[PDB]
Design a protein around this motif. Structure first.
Motif, PDB file in Angstrom:
ATOM      1  N   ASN A 459       0.467  -1.232   0.195  1.00 51.79           N
ATOM      2  CA  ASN A 459      -0.038   0.014   0.002  1.00 51.79           C
ATOM      3  C   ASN A 459       1.251   0.944   0.376  1.00 51.79           C
ATOM      4  OD1 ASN A 459      -2.026  -1.501   1.031  1.00 51.79           O
ATOM      5  ND2 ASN A 459      -1.916  -1.761   2.947  1.00 51.79           N
ATOM      6  N   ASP A 460       2.083   1.098   0.219  1.00 53.41           N
ATOM      7  CA  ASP A 460       3.257   2.335   0.913  1.00 53.41           C
ATOM      8  C   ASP A 460       4.459   2.762  -0.456  1.00 53.41           C
ATOM      9  OD1 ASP A 460       4.903  -0.081   1.985  1.00 53.41           O
ATOM     10  OD2 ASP A 460       4.841   1.601   3.516  1.00 53.41           O
ATOM     11  N   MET A 461       4.037   1.580  -1.106  1.00 55.84           N
ATOM     12  CA  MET A 461       5.301   2.234  -1.992  1.00 55.84           C
ATOM     13  C   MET A 461       4.150   1.997  -3.721  1.00 55.84           C
ATOM     14  SD  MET A 461       7.926   1.705  -0.530  1.00 55.84           S
ATOM     15  CE  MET A 461       8.674   0.940  -2.301  1.00 55.84           C
ATOM     16  N   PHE A 462       5.368   3.499  -4.363  1.00 63.54           N
ATOM     17  CA  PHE A 462       5.395   3.295  -5.600  1.00 63.54           C
ATOM     18  C   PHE A 462       3.075   3.980  -5.849  1.00 63.54           C
ATOM     19  CE2 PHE A 462       8.750   2.048  -6.143  1.00 63.54           C
ATOM     20  CZ  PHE A 462       9.594   2.769  -6.736  1.00 63.54           C
ATOM     21  N   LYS A 463       2.892   4.615  -4.695  1.00 64.93           N
ATOM     22  CA  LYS A 463       1.416   5.162  -4.797  1.00 64.93           C
ATOM     23  C   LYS A 463       1.547   6.650  -5.277  1.00 64.93           C
ATOM     24  CE  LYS A 463      -0.536   0.822  -4.463  1.00 64.93           C
ATOM     25  NZ  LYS A 463       1.003   0.215  -4.521  1.00 64.93           N
ATOM     26  N   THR A 464       0.427   7.514  -5.101  1.00 63.32           N
ATOM     27  CA  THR A 464      -0.125   8.486  -5.162  1.00 63.32           C
ATOM     28  C   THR A 464       0.803   9.056  -3.455  1.00 63.32           C
ATOM     29  OG1 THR A 464      -1.867   8.819  -3.972  1.00 63.32           O
ATOM     30  CG2 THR A 464      -1.760   8.691  -6.837  1.00 63.32           C
ATOM     31  N   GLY A 465       1.491  10.401  -3.593  1.00 58.70           N
ATOM     32  CA  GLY A 465       1.820  11.062  -1.977  1.00 58.70           C
ATOM     33  C   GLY A 465       2.906  12.283  -3.185  1.00 58.70           C
ATOM     34  N   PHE A 467       5.493  13.522  -1.970  1.00 64.16           N
ATOM     35  CA  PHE A 467       6.857  13.713  -2.606  1.00 64.16           C
ATOM     36  C   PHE A 467       7.333  11.630  -3.476  1.00 64.16           C
ATOM     37  CE2 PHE A 467       7.364  15.551   1.600  1.00 64.16           C
ATOM     38  CZ  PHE A 467       7.840  16.751   0.954  1.00 64.16           C
ATOM     39  N   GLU A 468       6.202  11.402  -3.764  1.00 63.41           N
ATOM     40  CA  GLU A 468       6.347  10.059  -4.898  1.00 63.41           C
ATOM     41  C   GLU A 468       6.608  10.424  -6.014  1.00 63.41           C
ATOM     42  OE1 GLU A 468       5.477   7.569  -1.968  1.00 63.41           O
ATOM     43  OE2 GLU A 468       6.604   7.775  -3.475  1.00 63.41           O
ATOM     44  N   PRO A 469       7.132   9.519  -6.785  1.00 63.58           N
ATOM     45  CA  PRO A 469       8.195   8.497  -6.715  1.00 63.58           C
ATOM     46  C   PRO A 469       9.166   7.903  -6.356  1.00 63.58           C
ATOM     47  CG  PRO A 469       8.281   8.620  -9.181  1.00 63.58           C
ATOM     48  CD  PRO A 469       7.408   9.701  -8.371  1.00 63.58           C
ATOM     49  N   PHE A 470       9.855   9.441  -5.617  1.00 64.77           N
ATOM     50  CA  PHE A 470      11.349   9.548  -5.179  1.00 64.77           C
ATOM     51  C   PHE A 470      11.040   8.745  -3.628  1.00 64.77           C
ATOM     52  CE2 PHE A 470       9.346  12.838  -7.344  1.00 64.77           C
ATOM     53  CZ  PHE A 470      10.550  12.918  -9.330  1.00 64.77           C
ATOM     54  N   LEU A 471      10.218   8.513  -3.061  1.00 64.99           N
ATOM     55  CA  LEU A 471      10.420   8.901  -1.896  1.00 64.99           C
ATOM     56  C   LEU A 471      10.138   6.787  -1.792  1.00 64.99           C
ATOM     57  CD1 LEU A 471       9.720   8.958   1.002  1.00 64.99           C
ATOM     58  CD2 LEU A 471       7.754   9.306   1.435  1.00 64.99           C
ATOM     59  N   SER A 472       9.641   6.557  -2.368  1.00 65.43           N
ATOM     60  CA  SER A 472       9.458   5.038  -2.646  1.00 65.43           C
ATOM     61  C   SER A 472      10.588   4.288  -2.938  1.00 65.43           C
ATOM     62  CB  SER A 472       7.956   4.610  -4.224  1.00 65.43           C
ATOM     63  OG  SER A 472       7.212   5.087  -2.929  1.00 65.43           O
ATOM     64  N   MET A 473      11.253   4.695  -4.161  1.00 66.49           N
ATOM     65  CA  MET A 473      13.160   4.889  -4.572  1.00 66.49           C
ATOM     66  C   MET A 473      14.134   5.063  -3.802  1.00 66.49           C
ATOM     67  SD  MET A 473      12.418   6.976  -8.066  1.00 66.49           S
ATOM     68  CE  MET A 473      13.867   6.573  -9.135  1.00 66.49           C
ATOM     69  N   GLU A 474      13.377   4.808  -2.233  1.00 70.23           N
ATOM     70  CA  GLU A 474      14.705   5.155  -1.635  1.00 70.23           C
ATOM     71  C   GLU A 474      14.279   4.501   0.075  1.00 70.23           C
ATOM     72  OE1 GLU A 474      16.970   7.151  -2.300  1.00 70.23           O
ATOM     73  OE2 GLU A 474      15.976   9.335  -3.093  1.00 70.23           O
ATOM     74  N   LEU A 475      13.223   3.487  -0.485  1.00 72.49           N
ATOM     75  CA  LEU A 475      12.561   3.016  -0.088  1.00 72.49           C
ATOM     76  C   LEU A 475      12.440   1.155   0.136  1.00 72.49           C
ATOM     77  CD1 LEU A 475       9.880   4.923   2.600  1.00 72.49           C
ATOM     78  CD2 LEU A 475      11.808   3.837   2.478  1.00 72.49           C
ATOM     79  N   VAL A 476      13.536   1.347  -1.616  1.00 75.31           N
ATOM     80  CA  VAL A 476      13.533  -0.476  -1.802  1.00 75.31           C
ATOM     81  C   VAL A 476      14.258  -1.269  -1.489  1.00 75.31           C
ATOM     82  CG1 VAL A 476      14.244  -1.695  -4.212  1.00 75.31           C
ATOM     83  CG2 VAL A 476      12.656   0.200  -4.458  1.00 75.31           C
ATOM     84  N   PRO A 477      13.243  -2.534  -0.524  1.00 78.58           N
ATOM     85  CA  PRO A 477      13.748  -2.956   0.371  1.00 78.58           C
ATOM     86  C   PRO A 477      15.555  -3.813   0.392  1.00 78.58           C
ATOM     87  CG  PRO A 477      12.383  -4.316  -0.117  1.00 78.58           C
ATOM     88  CD  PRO A 477      12.225  -2.980  -0.880  1.00 78.58           C
TER      89      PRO A 477
END
Length: 513
Positions: A459-465, A467-477
Motif C-alpha cells: 500500500n505504501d510503495m509507488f502510490k500517490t503522495g 513526495f512520490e515516486p521519489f520517496l518509494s525509490m528510497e525505500l526499495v527494501p
C-alpha cells in the motif's frame, strides 16, 4: 571447458572459481583433487564453499590459544579460568544459556574490569535485556543485543540516540530498520538525532526516516548535512534533490542542474531548468582489432587486475593498446579510470545484434548491459552471473535448452554478445510485459520478479503522495536493487537520447505512480 589440472595452473580469479564450481557441481572433483584446493579459490564464499565442504568438511577453526576455553559449557563455566570466562561471554547466546545465579556471580566478578560483561549478564537476568542496556546507555551492549536479536524495540531518549552514531554498527542499523520498516520505536526515536552528530549515508537515511513521519524540516536538515558530507557527487546530488523537493530553494535546483555527475537527479534538474542534455563522449576507434581474445574469461581477469592496479602512466599505454572496435568495451573501461570518472561513456558495442529491435528496446538492453558488465563479454560476478547481460546458469540453461532448444547449448554461450543480447531481449520481453516501467523492469532484472511484485503489492510503495515516486525509490527494501534501478534508469534515458528516441524523465516519473 577445462580439467582440474589446467585450472590449477591459472591465477586465482572469479573465472577460475567459476570453472572449479562447474567441476564440483558435476561431481568431477575427487576427494584427492580436493586436498590442496582452498589455496586455489579466489573467493571462498557461498556455493563453491558449500560444495567443497560436502567433499571435505571444515576441520578448523577455533584459535589454538583458547582451545581449552571451548571445552566448558553453561554448566561448568565457573570452573574455567578468568580469561576463558571472558572469552565465552563474547557470545550473547552463551550468556542467554547460563542460569541466573551464575549470571549474578559472573556480573560481580567482572564489574571493575569489564562492566560491559556485567551489564549484559545482569540484563539477561531480566525479562527485557534491551531495556536494561538502554537504561545504562551502554552503546556497545546495545549493538550486541540488536545483532543477537532484531525483535527488541524500545523508545530511546535524546541522549541515547545521539550517542548511537559514533558506533560503526550505526549506519547498517539505521538503514536496515528504515528500509525494512521494522523497529518502529527505534525509528521514531531517531527523529531526535542532531544532524550535527551524523553524516553521509546515515544522515541521508535519517532524512528519509523524517519524511516517513512527515517531519519535513528535520528531513531537510538531515539531507543538507548529507549533501555537505557525501564523498561522491552522485550521492550529493541525491541529497540536494531532496533539499529542493522539500523547501523549493531554486539555488539548490540550479546547483543540481550543473552537476558533473550524470544521474537521474541531475538529469531531471537539467530538464526542469531548460538546461541542455549533458555531453556524451564519442568513442569511434578506427583500428579493427588486436590480438586480445574477448572470448577468453581468464584473459579478462588478468587484464582487469592490471587496469585496476595501474598508475596514471600505464593507463595511457593500455588505452592505446585497446583502442580498437573489437576491444571497445575494454577501451572505455580504461578511459573511465584514466579520466578519474569525469567523462560520460555510453558505448554501443556489437550493435548489429540489436539494430533491428525498436529503439526503446535497444536503450533498455544497453542500459542493463552497461550497469551489469560494462559490456565485458566474459564478465563473471561473485554469484557466477555470466556475460554482458549477467545471466545466472539456471536462467541461461532454462532459456537456451528448455525454451530455445539450441543444439549443444552450454551456459558459457552467455559470453557471446549475440547470445547475451538475444537472451537479454527475451528476458526483458517477459519482464516488461508484466511490469511496464523500465524502472520496475530494472528492479526485477536485478532482484527477481518475485520481490518486485511483492514490493509493488504494498500500500505504501509507488502510490500517490506528496513526495512520490521519489520517496518509494528510497525505500526499495534491498540496497543493491535500490541503487541498480537509479543507475539503470539514468542509463536508459541517456541511450534513448543517443538513439534519437528521447523521452522526458518527468514522463517516466509520472508513469511510476
Amino acid at each position: 571447458q577445462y580439467s582440474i589440472e589446467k585450472l590449477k595452473k591459472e591465477e586465482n580469479s572469479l573465472a577460475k572459481d567459476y570453472y572449479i564450481y562447474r567441476l564440483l557441481e558435476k561431481n568431477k572433483i575427487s576427494k584427492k583433487d580436493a586436498q590442496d584446493l582452498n589455496s586455489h579459490i579466489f573467493r571462498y564464499i557461498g556455493k563453491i564453499k558449500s560444495e567443497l565442504e560436502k567433499i571435505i568438511p571444515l576441520k578448523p577453526y577455533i584459535n589454538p590459544k583458547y582451545a581449552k576455553c571451548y571445552t566448558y559449557t553453561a554448566n561448568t563455566i565457573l570452573d574455567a579460568n578468568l580469561t576463558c570466562q571472558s572469552v565465552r561471554l563474547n557470545s550473547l547466546v552463551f550468556i542467554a544459556s547460563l542460569n541466573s545465579k551464575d549470571r549474578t556471580t559472573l556480573a560481580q566478578t567482572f564489574k571493575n574490569q569489564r562492566p560491559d560483561l556485567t551489564n549484559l549478564l545482569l540484563a539477561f537476568n531480566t525479562s527485557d535485556p534491551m531495556s536494561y542496556i538502554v537504561q545504562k546507555e551502554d552503546i556497545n551492549g546495545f549493538f550486541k543485543l540488536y545483532n543477537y536479536s532484531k525483535k527488541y524495540d524500545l523508545d530511546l531518549n535524546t541522549s541515547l540516540v545521539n550517542k548511537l552514531p559514533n558506533h560503526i554498527g550505526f549506519k547498517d542499523f539505521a538503514q536496515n530498520i528504515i528500509i525494512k520498516k521494522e523497529n518502529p520505536k527505534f525509528r521514531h526515536s531517531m527523529l531526535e538525532i542532531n544532524p550535527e552528530n551524523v553524516s553521509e549515508d546515515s544522515a541521508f537515511y535519517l532524512g528519509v526516516n523524517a519524511l516517513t513521519y512527515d517531519k519535513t524540516e528535520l528531513a531537510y536538515d538531515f539531507f543538507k548535512k548529507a549533501a555537505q558530507s557525501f564523498k561522491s557527487q552522485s550521492n550529493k546530488d541525491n541529497a540536494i534533490f531532496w533539499m529542493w523537493l522539500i523547501k523549493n530553494n531554486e539555488e539548490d535546483l540550479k546547483t543540481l542542474s550543473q552537476s558533473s555527475s550524470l544521474n537521474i537527479y541531475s538529469l531531471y534538474a537539467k530538464e526542469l531548468t531548460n538546461t541542455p542534455f549533458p555531453k556524451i563522449e564519442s568513442l569511434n576507434p578506427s583500428k579493427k582489432k588486436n590480438n586480445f581474445n574477448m572470448q577468453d574469461p581468464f584473459a579478462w581477469q588478468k587484464i582487469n587486475k592490471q587496469i585496476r592496479d595501474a598508475n596514471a602512466s600505464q593507463l595511457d599505454v593500455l588505452a592505446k593498446e585497446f583502442d580498437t572496435q573489437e576491444t571497445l568495451p575494454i577501451y572505455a573501461y580504461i578511459l573511465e579510470r584514466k579520466n578519474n570518472f569525469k567523462k560520460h561513456y555510453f558505448i554501443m558495442p556489437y550493435y548489429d545484434n540489436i539494430k533491428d529491435y525498436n529503439k526503446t528496446r535497444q536503450a533498455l538492453i544497453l542500459a542493463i548491459a552497461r550497469q551489469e558488465s560494462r559490456f565485458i563479454p566474459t564478465a563473471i560476478s561473485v554469484s557466477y552471473a555470466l556475460g554482458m547481460m549477467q545471466f545466472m546458469p539456471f536462467l541461461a540453461n532454462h532459456i537456451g535448452e528448455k525454451e530455445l532448444k539450441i543444439p549443444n547449448f552450454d551456459q558459457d554461450f552467455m559470453f557471446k554478445p549475440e547470445i547475451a543480447y538475444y537472451f537479454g531481449n527475451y528476458h526483458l520481453n517477459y519482464l516488461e510485459s508484466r511490469l511496464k516501467s523500465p524502472l520496475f523492469v530494472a528492479y526485477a532484472y536485478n532482484g527477481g520478479i518475485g520481490f518486485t511484485n511483492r514490493m509493488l503489492a504494498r500500500n505504501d510503495m509507488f502510490k500517490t503522495g506528496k513526495f512520490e515516486p521519489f520517496l518509494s525509490m528510497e525505500l526499495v527494501p534491498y540496497q543493491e536493487s535500490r541503487i541498480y534501478g537509479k543507475k539503470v534508469l539514468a542509463n536508459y534515458i541517456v541511450y534513448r537520447h543517443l538513439l534519437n528516441d528521447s523521452i522526458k524523465i518527468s514522463d517516466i516519473f509520472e508513469n511510476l505512480i
